[PDB]
Design a protein around this ligand. Structure first.
Ligand SMILES: NC(=O)c1ccc[n+]([C@@H]2O[C@H](COP(=O)([O-])OP(=O)(O)OC[C@H]3O[C@@H](n4cnc5c(N)ncnc54)[C@H](OP(=O)(O)O)[C@@H]3O)[C@@H](O)[C@H]2O)c1
Length: 157
């Protein structure tokens, strides 16, 4: 199973200066819940910004750099390599990977961040006429989680 994993704002901003534009602990908990025990594929810039593999899942980095060899990370050098990855595979950014994979994934787990942030990277436009809402759940807010957000699971029609 091949799934997109992403948080984007009302204008589909996903990043600014190689980091998330928002601070939202609950969404990171959500994404770790979805992906534990599975596989995260990420482009090189996204990986470098995280800086270290996420524990308790297979971390795969897509890069053209043949000198890339990081402890606890598997490297791939083509999109085609993604299809050889066994199990539930999550496409986890950044913009380049989303653009390359959005026409290929089975479904998408999207957190809509219900705000407008300054961004330099975007999730590609998509339409609900291609995607059925399997679920839509409003995130609960508190002191440390102050931006309204909605967890979507969309499945390709
Ligand atoms: N909001 C979210 O849920 C979320 C999640 C993840 C990331 N992000 C954001 O996304 C932004 C980064 O996106 P980005 O597009 O700048 O970078 P990126 O997708 O993270 O990485 C781009 C790099 O990935 C490698 N790559 C991509 N396609 C390739 C291919 N077909 N063959 C070989 N290598 C390939 C290349 O690495 P090389 O140059 O080394 O060859 C390319 O330069 C950051 O701001 C980050 O915060 C947001």
């Amino acid at each position: 199973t091949l799934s997109i994993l992403v948080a984007h704002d009302l204008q589909r901003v996903i990043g600014f200066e190689n980091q998330l534009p928002w601070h939202l602990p609950n969404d990171l908990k959500h994404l770790k819940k979805l992906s534990t025990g599975h596989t995260l594929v990420m482009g090189r810039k996204t990986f470098e910004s995280i800086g270290k593999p996420l524990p308790n899942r297979r971390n795969v980095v897509l890069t053209s750099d043949t000198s890339f060899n990081v402890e606890g990370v598997d490297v791939i050098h083509s999109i085609e390599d993604i299809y050889q990855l066994p199990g539930h595979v999550f496409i986890f950014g950044g913009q380049t990977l989303y653009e390359e994979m959005i026409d290929k994934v089975d479904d998408m787990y999207i957190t809509v961040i219900e705000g407008k942030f300054r961004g330099d990277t975007f999730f590609p436009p998509y339409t609900f006429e291609d995607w059925e809402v399997a679920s839509s759940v409003e995130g609960k807010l508190d002191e440390k989680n102050t931006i309204p957000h909605t967890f979507l699971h969309l499945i390709r029609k």
